[PDB]
Amino acid sequence: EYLQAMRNFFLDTMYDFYTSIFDQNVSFLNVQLQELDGLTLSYKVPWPVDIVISLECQKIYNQVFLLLLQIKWAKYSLDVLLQIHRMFLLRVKLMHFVNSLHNYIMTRILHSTGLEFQHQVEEAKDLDQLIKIHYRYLSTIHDRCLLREKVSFVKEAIMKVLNLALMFADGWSIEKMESDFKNCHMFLVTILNKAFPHLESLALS
């Protein structure tokens, strides 16, 4: 029940939770929960479930939680809007790419592997092997979504395009964005054409 609640009431419901803070403080989080950097979360696991679910496992969950919140940050900042006409090209030119990156992270990894993972944890017959099959999902889901791999040759573009969702939100110049954007975009496409396999979903787009 906790494993199902983990991936469904965080990592939606938490989207609105994030959007209220988008437009702060440590006590605001609690009243919003009970109703792009930082953000702790605190919760306790009972001891018969704490000798299976580790304390360090929370530190693993925090890493992926942060990154998904940054994706929702850039996504929601661009989900408030619908040369002078060059801005509309910069709308299509970017909305594409952020939907492709979002589609990649959500569908290709977090919905394939998680649906297989529930079907796999029901095939654990004991306490100890349940820890092992869990950890052999943790250390690879921590790798598949980029948190340790190609951190400054693929990941840095994902970092730099998050601020474009802010700069383009303010204006609601234009050519000076697409000249940079198409260059880093082409670096990324010409690296990802050799790709581990799940990067080819956005190598084409």
């Binding site: 619908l82 790419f97 589609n103 919905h111």
Partner: protein, 420 residues
Amino acid sequence: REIITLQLGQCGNQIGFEFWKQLCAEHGISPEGIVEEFATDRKDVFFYQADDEHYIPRAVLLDLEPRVIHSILNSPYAKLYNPENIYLGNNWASGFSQGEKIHEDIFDIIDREADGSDSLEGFVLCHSIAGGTGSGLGSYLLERLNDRYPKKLVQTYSVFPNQDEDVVVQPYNSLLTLKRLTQNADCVVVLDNTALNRIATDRLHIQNPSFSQINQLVSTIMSASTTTLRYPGYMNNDLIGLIASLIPTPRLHFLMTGYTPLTTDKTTVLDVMRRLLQPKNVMVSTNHCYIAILNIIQGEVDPTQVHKSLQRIRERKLANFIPWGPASIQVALSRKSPYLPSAHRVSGLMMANHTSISSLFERTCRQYDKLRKREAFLEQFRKEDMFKDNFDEMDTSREIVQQLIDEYHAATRPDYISWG
């Protein structure tokens, strides 16, 4: 969040009542509003959160001279909703003037339901283009909502009128209503009665109870469009996140619809992708390429083969696309809806921004221009004459739809980097 639904006109009240019957049968809902013993899912999109979960629909019915409203009355689904939001000619001028004289109390009905709601996110208008009492009244009242509430979204469900022209002012009515759809609405979904009748004569040999069958079709359309909201999905749980991908230009908000099972009396996702890529699964009738295509699917799928399906459909290059810009086909998936009979388990629905609709607009333009040059098909309404002595509102709408046709054709060009 909370969206208030508007039903008006004979046609709009028909598909609205049918769709509310659809959602009553769909979720665990009694005909009285009582939560049933098989009801979980997200139930606050149109459903009033009552104590015993009397999920009262946010359904505002406003018309005058009630005929079909009596047929709505003798039904147990008049006990599903009634927060007293139900309110008791066929021309644009007559409906416009009738909406003018009683705008205040029906707008008070709107305001009462608005503050009674927890929030407001969209106006969903159940309508048909030149729907008789709906036309004129709806364009006027739509201007009242857009002036009065500029922070909300407008989606207008309507069908393209095909009654084989009899009212001769119908291109004028549709032209003025289409002007209001351009400037007072942010999304307009129109469907061809011709192509729907073609599909009805295709799958079966029935075309005579066309009203009843078309209620089933657009009720499937609207339930499928809101299924990701009303059942717990992941994205497009806001209307605006759904609308944003379709629109690069806020005057090009007219979308083509298609539905993958044409018979109901399953297989993999690549197959339905190839099916929906055919124009015979489309419910709507030079070179025209889509601006952006997005599909919703509901059924029994393989969660890895959807990647493989997009991969093969891409490398097939089974489509064209538009010169100016990186868009894509967009996949979206949700649950197959429980508590109803589930036949032909995969049902897909597509929203696409296509330039082919500019030809349909030009057909109505040519009809309006022909009747305008002849000038014997306005019938000299006195309400129209005192409303507009020179009838230059129709000239201004024709200018608007011509600007849209120009935007369509320059968007067909690669020079939509420049102005359209």
